């Protein structure tokens, strides 16, 4: 049954979900929310720069800079190594 749930990757997925929650909480609330609404984790839609701008009262350029800064600090060795084993 190709479409059947393998029942061992589901546990891996939920635990990786919890770990992603923790890693996102390590960062600042503003950047964490930007990334969440930018990649569609709270909901199913990864919104656009205009949408995060209208919900955060901030310019789209500043959003791009905040995303780049967030990604740079997210690249940090402990986060990268922690998430790397989950693959």
């Amino acid at each position: 049954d190709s479409e059947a749930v393998v029942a061992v990757d589901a546990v891996s997925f939920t635990l990786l979900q919890d770990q992603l929650q923790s890693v996102l909480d390590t960062l600042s609330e503003r950047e964490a929310g930007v990334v969440r609404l930018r990649f569609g984790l709270t909901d199913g839609q990864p919104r656009t720069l205009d949408e995060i701008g209208q919900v955060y009262g901030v310019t789209r350029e500043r959003i791009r800079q905040i995303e780049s800064k967030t990604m740079s600090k997210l690249r940090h060795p402990s986060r990268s190594q922690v998430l790397r084993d989950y693959l």
Binding site: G40, Q45, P46, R47, T48
Partner: protein
């Protein structure tokens, strides 16, 4: 580390493409499209693949955007006698 297919020579680091020694400047969208085509030489890439990778996921528009860009790339680098960026109707595009 230089991306190649016969005539076309794409270098990521210096960001331009050659036709056996013929460079041409391309738009960023079309550049990503060409790069992620060349790394998948001989493989069919469907429209959702193209849109999700080259464009962002949240692209809520209609698809013919990629049609126009493939037309751009064809009239730009396929302009040689032979046709490389062939199309499989209802499936996608392959450079070969």
């Amino acid at each position: 580390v230089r991306l190649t297919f016969a005539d076309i020579e794409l270098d990521e680091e210096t960001h331009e493409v050659w036709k056996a020694g013929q460079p041409v400047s391309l738009s960023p969208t079309e550049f990503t499209l060409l790069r992620y085509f060349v790394i998948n030489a001989g493989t069919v890439l469907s429209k959702p693949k193209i849109l999700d990778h080259v464009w962002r996921y949240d692209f809520g528009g209609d698809v013919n955007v990629v049609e126009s860009y493939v037309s751009y790339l064809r009239r730009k680098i396929d302009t040689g006698e032979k046709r490389l960026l062939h199309t499989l109707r209802g499936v996608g595009y392959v450079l070969r």
